[PDB]
Design an enzyme around this catalytic site. Structure first.
Site, PDB file in Angstrom:
ATOM      1  N   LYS A 215     -11.372   3.688 -19.167  1.00 12.45           N
ATOM      2  CA  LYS A 215     -12.196   4.716 -19.167  1.00 12.45           C
ATOM      3  C   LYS A 215     -12.643   5.203 -20.583  1.00 12.45           C
ATOM      4  O   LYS A 215     -13.722   5.295 -20.844  1.00 12.45           O
ATOM      5  CB  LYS A 215     -11.220   6.043 -18.509  1.00 12.45           C
ATOM      6  CG  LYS A 215     -12.356   7.529 -18.414  1.00 12.45           C
ATOM      7  CD  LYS A 215     -11.506   8.751 -17.636  1.00 12.45           C
ATOM      8  CE  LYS A 215     -12.648   9.701 -17.434  1.00 12.45           C
ATOM      9  NZ  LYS A 215     -12.015  11.017 -16.906  1.00 12.45           N
ATOM     10  N   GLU A 221      -2.097   0.137 -24.588  1.00 14.41           N
ATOM     11  CA  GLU A 221      -1.696  -0.827 -23.892  1.00 14.41           C
ATOM     12  C   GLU A 221      -2.906  -1.832 -23.617  1.00 14.41           C
ATOM     13  O   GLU A 221      -2.737  -3.133 -23.794  1.00 14.41           O
ATOM     14  CB  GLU A 221      -1.137  -0.617 -22.821  1.00 14.41           C
ATOM     15  CG  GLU A 221       0.352   0.125 -23.008  1.00 14.41           C
ATOM     16  CD  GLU A 221       0.434   1.555 -22.864  1.00 14.41           C
ATOM     17  OE1 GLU A 221      -0.747   2.390 -22.970  1.00 14.41           O
ATOM     18  OE2 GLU A 221       1.260   2.317 -22.054  1.00 14.41           O
ATOM     19  N   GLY A 276      -8.818   9.147 -13.646  1.00 17.05           N
ATOM     20  CA  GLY A 276      -8.432   7.683 -13.284  1.00 17.05           C
ATOM     21  C   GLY A 276      -7.807   7.495 -12.174  1.00 17.05           C
ATOM     22  O   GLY A 276      -7.920   6.387 -11.287  1.00 17.05           O
ATOM     23  N   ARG A 277      -6.942   8.432 -11.402  1.00 19.72           N
ATOM     24  CA  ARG A 277      -6.178   8.355 -10.250  1.00 19.72           C
ATOM     25  C   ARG A 277      -7.270   8.537  -8.987  1.00 19.72           C
ATOM     26  O   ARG A 277      -6.872   8.444  -7.779  1.00 19.72           O
ATOM     27  CB  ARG A 277      -5.062   9.479 -10.202  1.00 19.72           C
ATOM     28  CG  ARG A 277      -5.541  10.774 -10.356  1.00 19.72           C
ATOM     29  CD  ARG A 277      -4.252  11.796 -10.341  1.00 19.72           C
ATOM     30  NE  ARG A 277      -4.547  13.104 -10.747  1.00 19.72           N
ATOM     31  CZ  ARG A 277      -4.554  13.350 -12.184  1.00 19.72           C
ATOM     32  NH1 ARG A 277      -4.423  12.690 -13.077  1.00 19.72           N
ATOM     33  NH2 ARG A 277      -4.888  14.697 -12.185  1.00 19.72           N
ATOM     34  N   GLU A 362       0.830  12.814 -10.193  1.00 19.86           N
ATOM     35  CA  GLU A 362       0.025  13.037 -11.525  1.00 19.86           C
ATOM     36  C   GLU A 362      -0.926  14.342 -11.275  1.00 19.86           C
ATOM     37  O   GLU A 362      -1.261  14.929 -12.303  1.00 19.86           O
ATOM     38  CB  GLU A 362      -0.674  11.858 -11.809  1.00 19.86           C
ATOM     39  CG  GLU A 362      -1.225  11.862 -13.445  1.00 19.86           C
ATOM     40  CD  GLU A 362      -2.013  10.530 -13.693  1.00 19.86           C
ATOM     41  OE1 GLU A 362      -2.376  10.011 -12.718  1.00 19.86           O
ATOM     42  OE2 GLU A 362      -2.233  10.567 -14.711  1.00 19.86           O
ATOM     43  N   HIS A 393      15.508  -0.614   7.575  1.00 18.67           N
ATOM     44  CA  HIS A 393      17.150  -1.582   7.132  1.00 18.67           C
ATOM     45  C   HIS A 393      17.695  -1.046   6.051  1.00 18.67           C
ATOM     46  O   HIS A 393      18.909  -1.627   5.452  1.00 18.67           O
ATOM     47  CB  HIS A 393      16.644  -3.005   7.016  1.00 18.67           C
ATOM     48  CG  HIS A 393      16.265  -3.504   8.351  1.00 18.67           C
ATOM     49  ND1 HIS A 393      14.967  -3.596   9.026  1.00 18.67           N
ATOM     50  CD2 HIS A 393      17.212  -4.467   9.373  1.00 18.67           C
ATOM     51  CE1 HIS A 393      15.126  -4.038  10.165  1.00 18.67           C
ATOM     52  NE2 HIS A 393      16.310  -4.491  10.336  1.00 18.67           N
ATOM     53  N   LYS A 515       0.692   9.304 -25.650  1.00 17.60           N
ATOM     54  CA  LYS A 515       0.261   8.603 -26.788  1.00 17.60           C
ATOM     55  C   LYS A 515       0.374   9.428 -28.089  1.00 17.60           C
ATOM     56  O   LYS A 515      -0.488   9.821 -28.622  1.00 17.60           O
ATOM     57  CB  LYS A 515      -1.080   7.902 -26.553  1.00 17.60           C
ATOM     58  CG  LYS A 515      -1.467   7.026 -27.567  1.00 17.60           C
ATOM     59  CD  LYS A 515      -1.766   5.510 -27.231  1.00 17.60           C
ATOM     60  CE  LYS A 515      -3.020   5.172 -26.645  1.00 17.60           C
ATOM     61  NZ  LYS A 515      -2.865   4.994 -25.134  1.00 17.60           N
TER      62      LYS A 515
HETATM   63  O1  LIG Z   1      -4.248   8.749 -14.813  1.00 15.63           O
HETATM   64  C1  LIG Z   1      -4.406   8.576 -16.058  1.00 15.63           C
HETATM   65  O2  LIG Z   1      -5.206   9.348 -16.688  1.00 15.63           O
HETATM   66  C2  LIG Z   1      -3.769   7.423 -16.702  1.00 15.63           C
HETATM   67  O3  LIG Z   1      -3.140   6.482 -15.654  1.00 15.63           O
HETATM   68  C3  LIG Z   1      -5.024   6.533 -16.882  1.00 15.63           C
HETATM   69  O4  LIG Z   1      -5.410   6.382 -15.774  1.00 15.63           O
HETATM   70  C4  LIG Z   1      -4.463   5.331 -18.083  1.00 15.63           C
HETATM   71  O5  LIG Z   1      -3.863   6.111 -19.055  1.00 15.63           O
HETATM   72  C5  LIG Z   1      -5.518   4.361 -18.695  1.00 15.63           C
HETATM   73  O6  LIG Z   1      -6.485   5.308 -19.354  1.00 15.63           O
HETATM   74  P1  LIG Z   1      -7.878   4.517 -19.810  1.00 15.63           P
HETATM   75  O7  LIG Z   1      -8.591   4.260 -18.255  1.00 15.63           O
HETATM   76  O8  LIG Z   1      -8.638   5.638 -20.526  1.00 15.63           O
HETATM   77  O9  LIG Z   1      -7.524   3.453 -20.413  1.00 15.63           O
HETATM   78  O1  LIG Z   2      21.926  -3.055   4.789  1.00 15.02           O
HETATM   79  C1  LIG Z   2      21.898  -3.537   6.153  1.00 15.02           C
HETATM   80  O2  LIG Z   2      23.133  -3.767   6.833  1.00 15.02           O
HETATM   81  C2  LIG Z   2      20.574  -4.119   6.674  1.00 15.02           C
HETATM   82  O3  LIG Z   2      19.488  -4.075   5.905  1.00 15.02           O
HETATM   83  C3  LIG Z   2      20.589  -5.719   7.165  1.00 15.02           C
HETATM   84  O4  LIG Z   2      20.779  -6.266   5.782  1.00 15.02           O
HETATM   85  C4  LIG Z   2      19.595  -6.231   7.892  1.00 15.02           C
HETATM   86  O5  LIG Z   2      19.719  -5.361   9.011  1.00 15.02           O
HETATM   87  C5  LIG Z   2      19.660  -7.604   8.141  1.00 15.02           C
HETATM   88  O6  LIG Z   2      20.875  -7.765   9.133  1.00 15.02           O
HETATM   89  P1  LIG Z   2      21.385  -9.257   9.070  1.00 15.02           P
HETATM   90  O7  LIG Z   2      21.914  -9.746   7.703  1.00 15.02           O
HETATM   91  O8  LIG Z   2      22.714  -9.049   9.937  1.00 15.02           O
HETATM   92  O9  LIG Z   2      20.373 -10.093   9.632  1.00 15.02           O
END
Ligand SMILES: O=C(O)[C@@H](O)[C@H](O)[C@H](O)COP(=O)(O)O
Ligand SMILES: O=C(O)[C@@H](O)[C@H](O)[C@H](O)COP(=O)(O)O
Ligand SMILES: CNCC[C@H](O)c1cccs1
Ligand SMILES: CNCC[C@H](O)c1cccs1
Ligand SMILES: OC[C@H]1CC[C@H](CO)CC1
Ligand SMILES: OC[C@H]1CC[C@H](CO)CC1
Ligand SMILES: [Cl-]
Ligand SMILES: [Cl-]
Lengths: 550, 550
Positions: A215, A221, A276-277, A362, A393, A515
């Site tokens: 913007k 960055e 931006g958002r 934000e 899970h 900044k």
């Molecule tokens: O939400 C915001 O304002 C920030 O995330 C900007 O989106 C981000 O800092 C980038 O700014 P710019 O688009 O001016 O580089």
């Molecule tokens: O944290 C847990 O127990 C789950 O996320 C399991 O890892 C998931 O359900 C998969 O189970 P399994 O490894 O028996 O396939």
């Protein structure tokens, strides 16, 4: 200027506190369904999109009834939600602290309604940028735009951060079914040099196009990343004349774009009144138009526009984003739930929670009202999430059996873009969607645990309270239009929350501070001496870093 | 069995409530540094890893002083944190509800200490699995294990979910600098058919190896995914005799593996006492060893082992994971902060918060104690985050200026794997790390805002409260060993929290429920009649889906 100072000044606030104690705190959703055979119909709404596709928004498993919702609607009336909304659509400068209009709604004005800022219609100026986007994205996609050695572009790298990154990322991931083989997108955002190095390592300068998205076009960055990318490009191209075929800019600042070496004809502009958002609808969405084609991008915009029209024209009691926003206030301010969970039952939407986290937090992470006084009540919630079924899970353990209320939105498409194995995976996915919200509501009592075989001390460990609320959002298919409407839903939900709290949802004085202290320390990291200019922790960390750095 | 019922009734709990009222609530971190010139030294600890590398854990910007920390240590002694820890390391069945040992610490016992379960040492049995893992991963990397047409493997696809997915994902992303060109890893996990379709569409069956990762080898998503992958493989390969070169299993259940068509020789085993969310140290980490080589994987295990030794042998007042856990309790139970933010200033670690989100919330999201009574206090926090600097431009607005206290952990490496542009990006990344924590502590008062040029009503909008706490973790470099230590820090922090709350950190009855809920509804989606067997919302949602499905 504001019609009230604090949310706690509104008469319905105390009344809601009293309803919380009498009805809300101990609300039984099971009992609500038993009392009211029409509850699903009464607390669900079908949204119809511009293309006649539909989305069901079912709020009926929430801790709400007619009495409560009617009170929340009265609070919205007292807070002047409609007045502020209408001012937003009128182009008034409702971003009071920056003295700016708030006009992402104008970006998706594909109908070309009169939408003026400072008394001057924006419809044509917005449309002209979209036409430029169409022309450029079409030429990337059809090979008529060639690189410096005469080859079609294969890889498009967006460089930007925050609002100039997360929307492009999320939307290209979400709509990847609409992409074409052989044309890929990438997103460099972190200043961390890993992001640049890992992204560019295996790309071909001859067939890579950069979009520098900022913007302001001054973000530390982004300009550093963009410079490093230019250096990578030139390491192979070995002549600055080749930059013109490989670098475009998405910005409000033409002078700074030209100063960087990008031709003004390859700048895609937007205005101050695009936050931006709220920017993926603007020139910032160019990567989406390149990846899936302008017509799909336009359909995405039209989805947003149809939700905008719904928000603008619907009485509060039936206005879907308002209802979502009222329920958020109910949980945040009366139950004291600090978080809001969003779970897409959809792998393409795996970055949707992250995008909404920026939009929501934000916007609404503020402590000062439009009357310029501090809030001693809660404002923005902490939004988080991951896709299902994976989340089931993992942290769903806590959602089901922990000590914290976590209002949750579940999102499913009835139809998959990838109905492999005769839709077996899709039926399994959908079954999880229905069953999880059901379980969170109905729970499992002590008697049932015993019937299922547990005895003695094991029993309480296997009980589920139920009455854990969800909102279920069922779309027909996550098309561009549907996604556009879904994001706009959350935009206007966010709007509603902020209107009730009386905050400015549209500034970001913390992200702006982000900044200043960094530049000071950056110069200290360029000197050799140990530092003593800060508090002892900051000094200690810097000095330890100095001992450990390359 | 437990030595107490409820944390609220440990004698020190009521004392900590009194200290919260008198000193904690209004704690000034600025005043703390002014009162104690040695605060940074007193509230930071250097951890020394087995390889003589170091990590600084700086807790000095937290809302804590000696009085508070000493009370929290007393609370840990009253709760018997040390006795439960010692029982864990002894192999005792401290997972009371499933009657299992809790022995992820045994997985990284490279020292071959005696570590018995059921009175039989596990050291050699663990080591023998690791030898199998080394042999196989070496054979993939050296091209001695070829596909069915004699070609080296180029792509390794893990198929698993939850604990059988997120560690492999996070750690392969975190340690990507240690990979080799041409050997890639992929992770199919969601049942959503998009996940299989997008992952496999451009891979070559001839050079693709699958690892089916499942403790039980019965999980519906995983077995269904694995079947679809076998179908894809056979579409090209034709002959099922070729499955033996392309499919391996990571499991406790040999009978089900062999029933699936995988040779027992190609099963990499582990035991019941490995919880999924603590499983990346086991056979489940095979994708890591393949991607970065067994030696790097072993270094990762040795980093965890070193942190285990620290946790086992260090008095509570200097024990780094215990301190982190005590602060968590402080914020959760006395301040009422519901969340915990983890922000790596490191793009490789982009999936680190998601991994910790599972570790933390699935462990500690419980409402019943080891005395088998319900709690009357908060348990597990909601853990979330994204990498910085992205997060600074996402949701840090709310962290700085919102109405919620959000304890945050910031993590930086002093040295980058990718020090491009003569470390320019790295210095900028570091500057942000230091500046953000400084800013959260110091804030910016009304007078300074005025001095900087704001007048009248704009002034409050630009104020920052300060006294917003952070923990800063500075490593030398995120090597395998460092990452191993960092995960084990969070494992033992999680342990500490659970021990104080008197919960079982090691079961997951909500995750177990989820795995049996969907089949009921799945059968209803297979019939085409409308359903009325549930509450009206669940019926309404299923019936709308039926109208909208293909
Ligand atoms: O939400 C915001 O304002 C920030 O995330 C900007 O989106 C981000 O800092 C980038 O700014 P710019 O688009 O001016 O580089
Ligand atoms: O944290 C847990 O127990 C789950 O996320 C399991 O890892 C998931 O359900 C998969 O189970 P399994 O490894 O028996 O396939
Ligand atoms: C070719 N670029 C034109 C850009 C246009 O002038 C702008 C639109 C919005 C801000 S600047
Ligand atoms: C070749 N695979 C042998 C697996 C071994 O028997 C096991 C180790 C742990 C559980 S089963
Ligand atoms: O390995 C790719 C990397 C890209 C950025 C440049 C910046 O000088 C260095 C090479
Ligand atoms: O396009 C890749 C996709 C992978 C799964 C198979 C399962 O049958 C179908 C093809
Ligand atoms: Cl333009
Ligand atoms: Cl084995």
């Amino acid at each position: 200027m504001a019609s009230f100072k604090l949310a706690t000044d509104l008469p319905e606030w105390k009344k809601l506190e009293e309803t919380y104690k009498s009805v809300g705190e101990k609300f039984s959703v099971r009992d609500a369904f038993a009392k009211d055979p029409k509850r699903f119909e009464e607390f669900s709404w079908i949204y119809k999109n511009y293309d006649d596709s539909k989305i069901l928004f079912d709020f009926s498993k929430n801790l709400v009834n007619k009495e409560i919702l009617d009170q929340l609607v009265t609070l919205a009336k007292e807070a002047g939600v409609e007045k502020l909304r209408d001012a937003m659509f009128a182009g008034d400068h409702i971003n009071t602290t920056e003295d700016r209009a708030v006009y992402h709604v104008a970006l998706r004005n594909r109908a070309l309604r009169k939408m003026p800022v400072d008394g001057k219609d924006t419809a044509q100026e917005v449309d002209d940028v979209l036409k430029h986007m169409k022309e450029f994205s079409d030429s990337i996609r059809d090979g008529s735009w060639t690189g410096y050695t005469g080859k079609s572009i294969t890889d498009v790298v967006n460089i930007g951060i925050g609002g100039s990154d997360l929307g492009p990322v999320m939307v290209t991931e979400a709509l990847k079914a609409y992409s074409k083989p052989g044309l890929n997108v990438h997103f460099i955002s972190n200043i961390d040099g890993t992001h640049t190095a890992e992204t560019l390592k295996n790309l071909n300068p001859e067939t890579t196009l950069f979009l520098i998205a900022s913007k302001t076009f001054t973000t530390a960055e982004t300009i550093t990343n963009a410079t490093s990318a230019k250096n990578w490009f030139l390491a192979t191209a070995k002549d600055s004349k080749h930059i013109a075929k490989h670098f475009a800019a998405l910005s409000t600042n033409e002078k700074e774009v030209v100063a960087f070496g990008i031709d003004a004809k390859n700048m895609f502009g937007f205005e101050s009144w695009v936050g931006g958002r709220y920017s993926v609808w603007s020139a910032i969405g160019l990567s989406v138009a390149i990846y899936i084609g302008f017509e799909n991008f336009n359909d995405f915009l039209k989805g947003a526009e149809a939700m905008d029209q719904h928000f603008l024209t619907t009485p509060l009691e039936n206005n879907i984003p308002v209802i979502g926003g009222l329920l958020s206030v109910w949980y945040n301010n009366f139950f004291g739930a600090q978080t809001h969970l969003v779970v897409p039952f959809d792998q393409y939407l795996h970055r949707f929670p992250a995008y909404l986290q920026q939009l929501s937090m934000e916007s609404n992470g503020k402590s000062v009202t439009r009357a310029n006084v501090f809030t001693n009540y809660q404002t923005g919630t902490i939004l988080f999430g991951e896709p299902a079924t994976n989340a089931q899970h993992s942290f769903f353990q806590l959602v089901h059996q922990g000590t914290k209320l976590i209002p949750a939105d579940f999102i499913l498409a009835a139809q998959s873009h990838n109905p492999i194995e005769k839709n077996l995976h899709q039926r399994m996915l959908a079954s999880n969607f229905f069953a999880q919200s059901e379980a969170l509501m109905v729970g499992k009592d002590e008697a049932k645990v015993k019937a299922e075989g547990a005895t003695g001390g094991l029993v309480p460990h296997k009980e589920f309270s139920g009455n854990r609320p969800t909102t279920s959002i069922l779309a027909q298919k996550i098309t561009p239009a549907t996604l556009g409407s879904l994001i706009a839903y959350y935009e206007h939900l966010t709007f509603t929350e902020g209107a009730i709290w009386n905050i400015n949802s549209f500034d970001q004085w913390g992200v702006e501070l982000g900044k200043v202290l960094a530049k000071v320390i950056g110069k200290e990291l360029d000197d050799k001496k140990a530092v003593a200019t800060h508090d002892a922790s900051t000094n200690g960390l810097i000095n330890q870093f100095k001992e450990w750095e390359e």
